[PDB]
Amino acid sequence: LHSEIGRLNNQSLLWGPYRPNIYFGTRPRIGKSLMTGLMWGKIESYTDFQHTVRYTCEQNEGMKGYGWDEYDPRRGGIQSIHDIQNGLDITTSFVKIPGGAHGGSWAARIKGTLNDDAPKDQKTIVVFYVSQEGENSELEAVPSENEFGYEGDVILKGRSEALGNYKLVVTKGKGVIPQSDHDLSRLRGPGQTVVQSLTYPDEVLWQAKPILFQQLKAGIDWLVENKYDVADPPPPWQVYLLANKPGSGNVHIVQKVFEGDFEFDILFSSESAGKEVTSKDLEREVKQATEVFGERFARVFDLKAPFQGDNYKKFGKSMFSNLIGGIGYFYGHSLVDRSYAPEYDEENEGFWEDAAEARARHQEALEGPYELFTSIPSRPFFPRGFLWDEGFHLLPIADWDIDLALEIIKSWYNLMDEDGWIAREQILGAEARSKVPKEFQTQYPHYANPPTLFLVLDNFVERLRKLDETLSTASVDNPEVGLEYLRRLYPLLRRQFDWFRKTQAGDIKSYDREAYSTKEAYRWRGRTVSHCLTSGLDDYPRPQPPHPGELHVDLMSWVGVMVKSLISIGSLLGATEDVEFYTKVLDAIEHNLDDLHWSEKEGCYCDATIDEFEEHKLVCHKGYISLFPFLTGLLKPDSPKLGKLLALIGDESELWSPYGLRSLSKKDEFYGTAENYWRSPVWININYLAIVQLYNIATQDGPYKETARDLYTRLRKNIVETVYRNWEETGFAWEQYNPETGKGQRTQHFTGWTSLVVKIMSGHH
Ligand SMILES: O=[N+]([O-])c1cc(N2[C@@H]3CC[C@H]2COC3)ccc1NCc1ccc(CN2C[C@H](O)[C@@H](O)[C@H](O)[C@H]2CO)cc1
């Protein structure tokens, strides 16, 4: 039954609009296969189109906003794009029709509506770009009945091992096609849908904008040769219409020009299913998907008081839809330093200078290929998997579709190398690499990242202990399936546990350090003077200088999160020799948290270092770090230490803003300093952890239950209203929120862990 549900998830999920890096295109979960993409651009002049044309997601003064109104990766959804520069509001409805043996069929409708400020007679160039990768695969444009191009539909017939036989139809569409009076109409026609079928070496098929422009340029060059000039030039929209040349190729450019409003359909028919897909089919199965997205959302995300309002329901569907609509499939080579230099051991004082030397050896090699199906922080800025980001992305996605979340976790853990390392940033392939400056591309097998995926796995276990509809929950509804998932994954869970303890080890036994345990101390590898990137809290203030002495309280707390899941899972699998080792290490961490990290002076947990005179010195920087034992669910609900932490959270003068918890205390000396990334601003992912933990303490007998109810109630409201107010006035989820004003700052379209806000509103944790 496990392998049965396996094949059915494969078949349910294969197709999707899995290129979140571009405004609109589709690819299946297959490295070398069929890919599509949408480009559009107003043409007002002979030189403007190269500047106006749209393909890969950006965010500037040109673009008001864009994202999914609804989306389910299994069914599809609707995206709206609000383009100021091109005077255009576009809709991209996308829908999957299950059937046959090759992962179903699909269809899309592209509707452009000119906005009020746009010329009523604007000419918009639109392209559907189609590539196929493979040795033994074929894609051919069925030629036109007319001489110069197509009066109606464009039929692409194609085949591969992966997809079998399929046909891909770019429909005639509704809308006015401008006609040219010029002499050139005798040779290129007056204006019609055109196709160019070409072939390039597979590894450059993705570079669609340069490939398109090479043909536009070749058509312009032909004009200049064939005596067409400024005495009598054709209209620009005809200068940029490609000479029709359909046929065989691994690249097919379908080009339309529209005057005013336009729409047109894309129809993918798997021959291995029944009859081919029609435009009437698209209209029906879109409407039916809206209904299903409708029903599911009210059940899965039932927003509790005071956010049951329709305004907050709109906001929820948006924050959710952009989060789950960011799901991509990525395929190709990681850049890695597999040199494992001695300098990356970070055992010297000045280890950061040593580690700079090793990196300037430039021994990083391409390796793979690898595949990853994952959600992303940001379509425009960060369209790729980030390890600790995905822990948060999947909290809401698990609610929606636990089997989708386990599928993504499975994809991530299939990346783990022999030693137990998963790179924290997954830049899979030349396309992925094109968005990342060379400086940030190379990964390092000593660079860790918080294990937040365990938190999703924790939530899976609690759900276990206690057809699209069917398939979303199959892995809890059928307990033996759930367990076999865990049985296969468990060894990699354990391997990762073991890999932290070997590579991210703190040094007790070498220093004037006493403690209940000589094993349990951790220090993040990878840290520079100002930064500790691998923690996730890029520029949070840390012991100066950085030092092999350091112990980092957040790291220890993450190992606590891992060990508690290991126990819960292990005990469902009867890993008895293991469950005792785990219990003994949990016991040691709890004690060693206090012995190495608790400060009575300052009334919070702290990082540690080693002094100019070689004693163990606590370094206290009131903020997110200071709370970590609490945020990770590690403190008993009666603890005095929890109590002092609850004071620190609630105190306006330290951490408590009207807009949520500050990264760092206004009293701390590093408040608002340097890049001020994690040194004041409000971050929804760490606030979400506090909100969850406060609700735990609040629905329980103990001394703090009543405080924790005021703080939960208030923080939930402060976080949600800040993200909501900013969504209302700017159309965006933001990476972080200003502690002084509540304004969204840094990067837009951060969905992204800012979408955690849907689950905050939903409550009943
Ligand atoms: O360093 N840069 O200025 C940089 C710049 C550019 N670009 C391109 C190209 C230029 C430039 C400007 O546009 C695009 C591209 C990358 C970087 N790399 C840094 C970087 C990496 C990830 C994150 C997102 N967050 C930050 C969270 O703290 C972290 O916990 C969370 O893990 C993470 C993942 O979502 C943020 C910053």
From TrEMBL:
Protein name: Mannosyl-oligosaccharide glucosidase
Recorded topology in the membrane: Single-pass type II membrane protein
E.C. no: 3.2.1.106
Described purpose of this protein according to its UniProt entry: Cleaves the distal alpha 1,2-linked glucose residue from the Glc(3)Man(9)GlcNAc(2) oligosaccharide precursor.
Ranges where the Glycosyl hydrolase family 63 N-terminal domain occurs: 12-240
Disulfide bonding pattern of the chain: 606-620
Glycosylated residues, chain numbering: 10
PANTHER family tied to this protein: MANNOSYL-OLIGOSACCHARIDE GLUCOSIDASE
Pathway annotation from the record: Glycan metabolism; N-glycan degradation
InterPro entries in the cross-refs: 6-hairpin_glycosidase_sf, 6hp_glycosidase-like_sf, Glyco_hydro_63_C, Glyco_hydro_63N, Glyco_hydro_63N_sf, Glycoside_hydrolase_63
Catalytic activity: N(4)-(alpha-D-Glc-(1->2)-alpha-D-Glc-(1->3)-alpha-D-Glc-(1->3)-alpha-D-Man-(1->2)-alpha-D-Man-(1->2)-alpha-D-Man-(1->3)-[alpha-D-Man-(1->2)-alpha-D-Man-(1->3)-[alpha-D-Man-(1->2)-alpha-D-Man-(1->6)]-alpha-D-Man-(1->6)]-beta-D-Man-(1->4)-beta-D-GlcNAc-(1->4)-beta-D-GlcNAc)-L-asparaginyl-[protein] + H2O = N(4)-(alpha-D-Glc-(1->3)-alpha-D-Glc-(1->3)-alpha-D-Man-(1->2)-alpha-D-Man-(1->2)-alpha-D-Man-(1->3)-[alpha-D-Man-(1->2)-alpha-D-Man-(1->3)-[alpha-D-Man-(1->2)-alpha-D-Man-(1->6)]-alpha-D-Man-(1->6)]-beta-D-Man-(1->4)-beta-D-GlcNAc-(1->4)-beta-D-GlcNAc)-L-asparaginyl-[protein] + beta-D-glucose
Glycosyl hydrolase family 63 C-terminal domain sequence ranges: 278-761
Domain of life, source organism: Eukaryota
Organism whose genome encodes this protein: Chaetomium thermophilum (strain DSM 1495 / CBS 144.50 / IMI 039719)
